[PDB]
Design a binder for this molecule. Structure first.
Ligand SMILES: OCc1ccccc1OC1CCOCC1
Length: 209
């Protein structure tokens, strides 16, 4: 059973600006997703400080980068707090409406797209390199759900029947045809070292056969 939702008009405008603006520094998408993962890991760690049972769904707190050249997907996995269904529908746990409004006023006032993370809507930078984004998430207080959007003003939410995650979030980037460089090991390592050297969680870059 698949539910189709319309993006709020401001979020649809943010997504089309990310997709249509000529802007060569696309690699910052990975810094933004890793930083989101770090924030999600910070949240579950803080909750575990007064309730250790919050980690019954998984004691390890990490970030995995899984490239797959056959599927042409880059997957960012974290074992953070995850998102409920309401969180997914409500712009994936962000205040995206007010964040987009501030971001667009900054762009007309000199800012560039690399600054998107300062306005709390860094997730949507995924559409700099992805034609379609799938978000699989599991929160302790809800079931596993799958969020998906190819932009175009709508997204879908369904119960995920795939591989159980325990707890955390999985961002699957179905990359554009001309953006497969972000599946190469040395390019991913370069970006992680350049923009994510101070992330307080182990970032493991998977290799392929
Ligand atoms: O796993 C991190 C993540 C993945 C996809 C979308 C958003 C997102 O980050 C939100 C803010 C941090 O915590 C709540 C979720």
């Amino acid at each position: 059973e698949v539910e189709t939702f319309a993006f709020q008009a401001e979020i649809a405008q943010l997504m089309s600006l990310i997709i249509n603006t000529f802007y060569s520094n696309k690699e910052i998408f990975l810094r933004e997703l890793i930083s989101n993962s770090s924030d999600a890991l910070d949240k579950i760690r803080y909750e575990s400080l007064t309730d250790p049972s919050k980690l019954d769904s998984g004691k390890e707190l990490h970030i995995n980068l899984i490239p797959n050249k056959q599927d042409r997907t880059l997957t960012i996995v974290d074992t953070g707090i995850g998102m409920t269904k309401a969180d997914l529908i409500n712009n994936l746990g962000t205040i995206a409406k007010s964040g987009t409004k501030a971001f667009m006023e900054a762009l007309q006032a000199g800012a560039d797209i690399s600054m998107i993370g300062q306005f709390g809507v860094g997730f949507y930078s995924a559409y700099l390199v992805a034609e379609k984004v799938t978000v699989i998430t599991k929160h302790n207080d809800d079931e596993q759900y799958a969020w998906e959007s190819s932009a175009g003003g709508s997204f879908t939410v369904r119960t995920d029947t795939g591989e159980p995650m325990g707890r955390g979030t999985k961002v699957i980037l179905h990359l554009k045809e001309d953006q497969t460089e972000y599946l190469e090991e040395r390019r991913i390592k370069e970006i992680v070292k350049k923009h994510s050297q101070f992330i307080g969680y182990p970032i493991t870059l998977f290799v392929e056969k």
